[PDB]
Amino acid sequence: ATIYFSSPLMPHNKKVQAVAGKRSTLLGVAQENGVKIPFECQDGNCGSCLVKITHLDGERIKGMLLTDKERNVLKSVGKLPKSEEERAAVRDLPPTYRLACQTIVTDEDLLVEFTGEPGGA
Amino acid sequence: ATIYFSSPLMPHNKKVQAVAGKRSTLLGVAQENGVKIPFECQDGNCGSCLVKITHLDGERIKGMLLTDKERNVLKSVGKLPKSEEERAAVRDLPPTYRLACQTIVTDEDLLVEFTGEPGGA
Amino acid sequence: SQQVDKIKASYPLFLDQDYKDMLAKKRDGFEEKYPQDKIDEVFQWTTTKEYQELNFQREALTVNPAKACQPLGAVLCALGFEKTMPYVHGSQGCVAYFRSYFNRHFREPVSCVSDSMTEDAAVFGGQQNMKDGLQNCKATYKPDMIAVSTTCMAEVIGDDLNAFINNSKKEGFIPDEFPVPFAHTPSFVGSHVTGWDNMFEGIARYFTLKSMDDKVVGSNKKINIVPGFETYLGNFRVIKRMLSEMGVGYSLLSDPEEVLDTPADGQFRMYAGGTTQEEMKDAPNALNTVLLQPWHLEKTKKFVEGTWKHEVPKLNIPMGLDWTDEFLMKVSEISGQPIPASLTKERGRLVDMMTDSHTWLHGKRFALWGDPDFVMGLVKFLLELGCEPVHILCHNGNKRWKKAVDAILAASPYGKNATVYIGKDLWHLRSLVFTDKPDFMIGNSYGKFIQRDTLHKGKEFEVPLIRIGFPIFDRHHLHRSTTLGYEGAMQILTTLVNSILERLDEETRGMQATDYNHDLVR
Amino acid sequence: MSREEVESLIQEVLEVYPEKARKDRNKHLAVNDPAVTQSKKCIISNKKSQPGLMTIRGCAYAGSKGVVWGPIKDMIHISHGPVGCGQYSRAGRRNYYIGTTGVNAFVTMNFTSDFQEKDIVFGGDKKLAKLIDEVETLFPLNKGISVQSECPIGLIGDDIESVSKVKGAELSKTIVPVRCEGFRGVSQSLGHHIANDAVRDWVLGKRDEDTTFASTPYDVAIIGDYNIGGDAWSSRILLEEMGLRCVAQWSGDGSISEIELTPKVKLNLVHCYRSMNYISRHMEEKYGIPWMEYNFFGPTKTIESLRAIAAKFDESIQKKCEEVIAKYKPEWEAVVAKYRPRLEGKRVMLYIGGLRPRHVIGAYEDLGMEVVGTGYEFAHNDDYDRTMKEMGDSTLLYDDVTGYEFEEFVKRIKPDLIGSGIKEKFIFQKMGIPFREMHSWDYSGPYHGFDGFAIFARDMDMTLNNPCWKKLQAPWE
Ligand code: ICS
Ligand code: CLF
Ligand code: FES
Ligand code: FES
Ligand SMILES: [Ca+2]
């Protein structure tokens, strides 16, 4: 899997090769490769590691489980519209906004964008 | 080179393998792969094939020549801020907005985004 | 087409001409199947001695294993106790597979619960799953004890069961006096028999470790019996009937015979019988503890010797004549009760049965496989009958067990061509029976395909399968059989001799070709 | 029973649960209203399972290896991880096939890496390569390898995609890594999604640039029929007596070549929507192949589905469909005449995985049997949208039912017959209530088509009217 980290803080987007399905959840990848996503909790109930993930392959998007913890955190932050929640619940497709501490890397090309700010704003 | 075409019109982003430096100028690639960027001229003075190109590799951005025709068209459309024009003129770095019929593909990973609309709006 | 008076199921409906034509068209047009000559060449190649040499050089590939994971045995051991709910801390597919396996083997309801851990539990641990599962399990099914095992997810993650349960009791999810024994049962270490040992050791720890000060060895004048991973209700019943006839006071720890066999009388009983918690608390007060299957109860032996101070006698599994005699003599020595006449007569009847059927069993070559204790007991009994166990296999075996089995074989002329294998699967056994053909096979239901492989080569190369072991899926109610003691020896002898006679009858039924040997009296 | 009695029963059952579990389980139970089209107003689905409540769901590994990838016969399916997952799912599913097992077919064989503790600590990416080499050495006639991941694989961080790519480049063999860890999904449905994604990304597109296949306007493919007890076969003949040419079956009695030839057809007939809609939509989007859902349970549904499929084609196909219906009419009429009087008015409660709780309702209706309750294990809201138009008014609906909930519902309603899996068979057989395995057809079948309807009726009659259900009560009690 190829992950392209982009952010206003980063001078350039960073291309990273990652192993799919590891217990490290794309935070581990960011911390290994020096990408600084704000992670400020250890349970998963804050929104700091909020990122926007774009599937660059389009025809290679994998099915995933949107856990109730991540769904509730995204709804508390306000980055989970009703349509995307319904799509995740019914068709098992990931939403556009994810939490970088709970997102398991899949075997595809992804563009991860963050603002260096907590999830809420 | 890997080019990811993204657009609201397209149901999914399309990944395309392309040969760098061909006389076909990323329009040819789009027309070969079925991507529908609005091209409505044959000389290069309209803004229709305006796209936004993001270099996903960041540390692999290649130097390029911003021809006065493309620069004038971008300034007529209004997608060439003074800072990016100065950067292109001095440091030979490409701007964020390009014209898909005058953009020569380089050996890097690119994300090309269009709105299915002419350049001006 | 179907006829309303002669309805045909999948066999032999698909043998009709229309179905044959449809399948032939499918295969010819779209399957791109290899030519039948290539298939026949490859099949004959697999039966050669050259293929066996490549097969036995396998180091990373396992084909048709002959073992399961630890939590299966852990679940069985948990079911062994009274009002005990097996609770597997991990993903929920494991529990479904365990229940399906045990339902297909015993054809009786099996009750187990899970924490239904998921991707959030893989990242942040499964402590909340533990708390909620314990609370829900105690509230809904109302058990008197919850016995916690682990899958391979919880082990790889590194979930601390003791911490999770202690934090669950102090938080108020379950009362502090509610017994929740736990055990770590990694599925990548050992097999299903090891999980039974780990679960029993954990339960014994939970019930006896903190109260050994006021325990005197011999207070209740009883003997503890630890059966182990046993999948025959008849073994549980015979191991209690023999002691009851003997007059010995006994306490069967982890007895699932009652829950795994309940009457069909209009009501469903989730719990039945089982060892009570009082028996587990009083276990250290017993005269001595006997492990029926000592080759997978090693950790339990360590705990019993170190903590309970009981000097566990070194006995073999009561399979056969000599080992049953040794077990009875050791029990008589420990309890002081003389062996009654009702067991000497049974031994004499078994010897009479052996003498009557020795002319058919002598010289027969058998290939066997299964659990270490069961396999070694079966090998000893076969040696007592004059049979030749040419191929001996035990996927979940160690080198000390192999050495013991070799020592047993060397102490008998018939254990001359025998070869013991450990770490080998059923594909190795298929290769072995093709090149060194035995007369029969003794194993679980997974050995039927091997027989089908031997028939394809030819009727003269077919190796019939005798189903003794676990699991048995293609036969009904064989789990009620017995393999321990004299009664089990009688049943095994009957099965072996009747399988031999049935095969002989099948080979000599062709009229005017081989039916001259179709003797009425055989 | 009316809507008032059923809701009282639902509340009484839920009274024993803890308050959080009670609130969660109240959403998954409902009383059917056929006028409701949006099931989300009534029933929630595809949610996690409440811990410790003894659910009946499975894992993503069961959904992928057990259900989708397993029936493929010409491939070899490695179970990467410990022994248990592969051992328990071996030959437990009656997906029939034709081949020489161990030579060119490998459905009922268990290939596993058999992880030890040294592989959990030091990884298993070299063991996988050595295993692939040994598989190529010992089974030369295999047409592909699929590595199904078990639970430890994702947790220890093993890169199997790289191994698959390297060994496929080396051996020129199709190696498909499936990340079907058991913890990745709440049930088997995500296993279906993962398996369909693997098929799409590693197998389906091999012959995109090949045009040597001779296509016809009558080419179709059977999707989501796994040939339980021969079911797919009983369907395939019914689709070839109408002149259509079934190019591929997914996946019962299927081969890796039919999967690759599937994009060369003119219509996809999807039997199980739940497990194969993911690939049906992908094929419609990419290759333009339309797809439609058909039901071959019972005579009525079979006739309706055949008429629809014929309507998808020209007039000759419709004439052949009418000929087939006329030919098979007396056969199922005789079965109905014989068995309906015996099975008239009986009440049934069903609980199956994701498709059959609504598909087999038509078969029970044709025998005069009323389904007084149905439910799924891992169905989504779509499935309940389709279900609400099938069930009668005031009939009970449940989702991911527990042992307690199902037992209490059965005790109050007292159905004449129950259809569910092996894990509930003996629970209700000790209660004196006839039970039919609706997963494996109770080792009988097939049940699809007109040939399977006779078997269906015979089995239902032999189980409901068996003389063994009158003897449970001892005469001296
Ligand atoms: S695949 Fe699915 S549980 Fe559609 S996982 Fe399950 S052989 Fe069921 S209701 Mo077993 S979605 Fe098939 C099923 Fe239905 S294994 Fe079979 S019977 S029609
Ligand atoms: S949820 Fe599914 S079936 Fe479970 S382990 Fe995981 S992939 Fe497999 Fe496997 S060996 Fe035994 S049965 Fe389990 S504890 Fe591991
Ligand atoms: S860092 Fe708290 S939610 Fe990811
Ligand atoms: S199309 Fe006119 S500018 Fe490119
Ligand atoms: Ca029973």
mmCIF file of N, CA and C in Angstrom, chain C residues 2-4 7, chain D residues 329-341 367 450 453-458:
data_model
loop_
_atom_site.group_PDB
_atom_site.id
_atom_site.type_symbol
_atom_site.label_atom_id
_atom_site.label_comp_id
_atom_site.label_asym_id
_atom_site.label_seq_id
_atom_site.Cartn_x
_atom_site.Cartn_y
_atom_site.Cartn_z
ATOM 1 N N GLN C 2 -38.209 -35.495 -11.548
ATOM 2 C CA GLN C 2 -38.567 -36.175 -10.315
ATOM 3 C C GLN C 2 -39.914 -36.866 -10.466
ATOM 4 N N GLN C 3 -40.039 -38.020 -9.818
ATOM 5 C CA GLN C 3 -41.281 -38.781 -9.769
ATOM 6 C C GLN C 3 -41.830 -38.695 -8.352
ATOM 7 N N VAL C 4 -43.134 -38.455 -8.234
ATOM 8 C CA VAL C 4 -43.760 -38.166 -6.947
ATOM 9 C C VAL C 4 -43.709 -39.385 -6.033
ATOM 10 N N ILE C 7 -38.627 -40.251 -5.318
ATOM 11 C CA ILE C 7 -37.883 -38.999 -5.282
ATOM 12 C C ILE C 7 -36.424 -39.297 -4.977
ATOM 13 N N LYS D 329 -44.533 -28.470 -15.315
ATOM 14 C CA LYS D 329 -45.767 -28.206 -14.585
ATOM 15 C C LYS D 329 -46.354 -29.445 -13.906
ATOM 16 N N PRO D 330 -46.571 -30.561 -14.622
ATOM 17 C CA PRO D 330 -47.184 -31.721 -13.952
ATOM 18 C C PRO D 330 -46.334 -32.293 -12.834
ATOM 19 N N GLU D 331 -45.008 -32.219 -12.961
ATOM 20 C CA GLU D 331 -44.132 -32.804 -11.952
ATOM 21 C C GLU D 331 -44.319 -32.128 -10.600
ATOM 22 N N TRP D 332 -44.251 -30.796 -10.564
ATOM 23 C CA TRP D 332 -44.469 -30.099 -9.304
ATOM 24 C C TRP D 332 -45.932 -30.082 -8.890
ATOM 25 N N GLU D 333 -46.868 -30.144 -9.839
ATOM 26 C CA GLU D 333 -48.268 -30.288 -9.467
ATOM 27 C C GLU D 333 -48.539 -31.581 -8.712
ATOM 28 N N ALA D 334 -47.937 -32.692 -9.142
ATOM 29 C CA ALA D 334 -48.099 -33.950 -8.420
ATOM 30 C C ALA D 334 -47.515 -33.862 -7.015
ATOM 31 N N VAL D 335 -46.345 -33.235 -6.877
ATOM 32 C CA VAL D 335 -45.720 -33.093 -5.565
ATOM 33 C C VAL D 335 -46.607 -32.270 -4.643
ATOM 34 N N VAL D 336 -47.139 -31.158 -5.157
ATOM 35 C CA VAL D 336 -48.043 -30.342 -4.357
ATOM 36 C C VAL D 336 -49.274 -31.140 -3.962
ATOM 37 N N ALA D 337 -49.889 -31.844 -4.915
ATOM 38 C CA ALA D 337 -51.096 -32.605 -4.610
ATOM 39 C C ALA D 337 -50.833 -33.664 -3.550
ATOM 40 N N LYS D 338 -49.651 -34.281 -3.575
ATOM 41 C CA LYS D 338 -49.352 -35.318 -2.597
ATOM 42 C C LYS D 338 -49.061 -34.740 -1.216
ATOM 43 N N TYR D 339 -48.298 -33.647 -1.145
ATOM 44 C CA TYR D 339 -47.749 -33.240 0.144
ATOM 45 C C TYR D 339 -48.484 -32.080 0.804
ATOM 46 N N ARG D 340 -49.147 -31.210 0.032
ATOM 47 C CA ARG D 340 -49.827 -30.063 0.635
ATOM 48 C C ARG D 340 -50.890 -30.464 1.651
ATOM 49 N N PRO D 341 -51.749 -31.477 1.409
ATOM 50 C CA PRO D 341 -52.743 -31.844 2.428
ATOM 51 C C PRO D 341 -52.127 -32.186 3.775
ATOM 52 N N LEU D 367 -46.696 -24.906 -0.183
ATOM 53 C CA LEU D 367 -47.156 -26.092 0.528
ATOM 54 C C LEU D 367 -48.190 -25.758 1.595
ATOM 55 N N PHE D 450 -37.239 -27.123 -10.086
ATOM 56 C CA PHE D 450 -38.378 -28.023 -9.985
ATOM 57 C C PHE D 450 -38.005 -29.400 -9.459
ATOM 58 N N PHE D 453 -37.773 -29.130 -5.561
ATOM 59 C CA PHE D 453 -39.009 -28.891 -4.830
ATOM 60 C C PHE D 453 -39.614 -30.179 -4.289
ATOM 61 N N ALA D 454 -39.521 -31.270 -5.050
ATOM 62 C CA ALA D 454 -39.994 -32.558 -4.557
ATOM 63 C C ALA D 454 -39.215 -32.984 -3.321
ATOM 64 N N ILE D 455 -37.891 -32.822 -3.355
ATOM 65 C CA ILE D 455 -37.061 -33.168 -2.204
ATOM 66 C C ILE D 455 -37.414 -32.285 -1.016
ATOM 67 N N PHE D 456 -37.617 -30.991 -1.270
ATOM 68 C CA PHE D 456 -38.009 -30.062 -0.215
ATOM 69 C C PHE D 456 -39.296 -30.515 0.463
ATOM 70 N N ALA D 457 -40.322 -30.802 -0.338
ATOM 71 C CA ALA D 457 -41.606 -31.218 0.216
ATOM 72 C C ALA D 457 -41.478 -32.535 0.969
ATOM 73 N N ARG D 458 -40.722 -33.483 0.411
ATOM 74 C CA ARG D 458 -40.557 -34.779 1.058
ATOM 75 C C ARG D 458 -39.867 -34.635 2.407
#
